Design a protein around this ligand. Structure first.
Ligand SMILES: *C[C@@H]1C(=O)C2CCN1CC2
Ligand SMILES: *C[C@@H]1C(=O)C2CCN1CC2
Ligand SMILES: *C[C@@H]1C(=O)C2CCN1CC2
Ligand SMILES: *C[C@@H]1C(=O)C2CCN1CC2
Ligand SMILES: *C[C@H]1C(=O)C2CCN1CC2
Ligand SMILES: *C[C@H]1C(=O)C2CCN1CC2
Ligand SMILES: [Zn+2]
Ligand SMILES: [Zn+2]
Lengths: 192, 192
DNA sequence: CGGGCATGCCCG
DNA sequence: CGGGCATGCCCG
């Protein structure tokens, strides 16, 4: 009955976790302390998928944004009117690049947007699979996120629709990821 | 042949001038030193029309915005996509309130927007006529003015289309007119 | 209300 | 590139 998707971590029977590359006032940088990606608009944000056990054939990887703060959690996250007017429907915040099987979904009941690609196991000798996401507005965009923090929820789903795993990370899309990560980490240490 | 309207002051044979009320970190405030109105979005910006000689019956008062800086002067000033989506067409920046004969014009050749009302002479004992303009975006709106200063051009035109007078003033539509007027006047004194 | 943060962007 | 302005908005 809820129109708010779960954000609860569920690493599940396949041992699903996300990973991030190591990254200066930079196009993206991930804070482990904050579980938060800082990235620039319309630029690559790589996300690694790690599993302990191989998901079945036909597994899918879905990404969806939700507002982090309770007061905004019921509002659908969408592209702002300016960037909408500038495969992906123009209203979608999150895109996937570099994939020939990307599907964009608008839920008929919840109106939430999501982007899905097939799960592919790592190549031999590799421990993870990387997806290249793109966020098409800044967190600050007027008429869109409007300075409200979001979480990205990554779910691993079988072809039948069973939830196999779920993880999430906060995102700030901003002009100066390195500056803003340093500011937020310092604020955590000083006032958190 | 130009699609850029003239901004040259022409006080003309009727002695046409504009005047502004005297106005604190306020909903509007006018700087004589800068010839610049500082006002808030979607709030009244009164403009006084002064003449030495009475214009003929059927005279009209037109207002049009143009970008002040040479680099932007050929671009039409429009409402940003966010405020457009929130009588006046939604794309028009400048509205007139309190008038039952307001006309909104989109020029078929230049694409410029303007808003026109009939000229009315002052009531007996008064020396000026006041029009209540409204600016429907901040100067800073992304996808609209985008922090570029504008001028408002006020023309007095007869019913036949003859230009009787023209005046202009700079406008900054902003959250804190009193703060910003003080900052700009101090910068003029210190660095201008 | 005024002080001061915010954050995309400017300038060196 | 990094320092620091910008400017709608937050908090007291
Ligand atoms: C987004 C950034 C980059 O461009 C590389 C890969 C992931 N992060 C860290 C370095
Ligand atoms: C999971 C692995 C790694 O740790 C490196 C970068 C991404 N994949 C391929 C090699
Ligand atoms: C816009 C402001 C106001 O609200 C009054 C009239 C004109 N200015 C100065 C005071
Ligand atoms: C021009 C006149 C004035 O100076 C005051 C305010 C506006 N009109 C009416 C009275
Ligand atoms: C964050 C800051 C930088 O370091 C350059 C890119 C974006 N912004 C302006 C210059
Ligand atoms: C300009 C500043 C003020 O003084 C109040 C109105 C708008 N802004 C926030 C509070
Ligand atoms: Zn946007
Ligand atoms: Zn606007």
């Amino acid at each position: 009955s809820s129109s708010v998707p779960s954000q609860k971590t569920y690493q599940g029977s396949y041992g699903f976790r996300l990973g991030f590359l190591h990254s200066a006032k930079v196009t993206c940088t991930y804070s482990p302390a904050l579980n938060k990606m800082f990235c620039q608009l319309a630029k690559t944000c790589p996300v690694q998928l790690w599993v302990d056990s191989t998901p079945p054939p036909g597994t899918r990887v879905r990404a969806m944004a939700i507002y982090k703060q309770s007061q905004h959690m019921t509002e659908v996250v969408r592209r702002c009117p300016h960037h909408e007017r500038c495969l992906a429907p123009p209203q979608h915040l999150i895109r996937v690049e570099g994939n020939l099987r990307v599907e964009y979904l608008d839920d008929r009941n919840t109106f939430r947007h999501s982007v899905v690609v097939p799960y592919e196991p790592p190549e031999v000798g590799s421990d993870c699979t990387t997806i290249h996401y793109n966020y098409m507005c800044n967190s600050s965009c007027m008429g869109g996120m409007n300075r409200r923090p979001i979480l990205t929820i990554i779910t691993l789903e079988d072809s039948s629709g069973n939830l196999l795993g779920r993880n999430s990370f906060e995102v700030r899309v901003c002009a100066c990821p390195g500056r803003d990560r340093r500011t937020e980490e310092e604020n955590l240490r000083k006032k958190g």
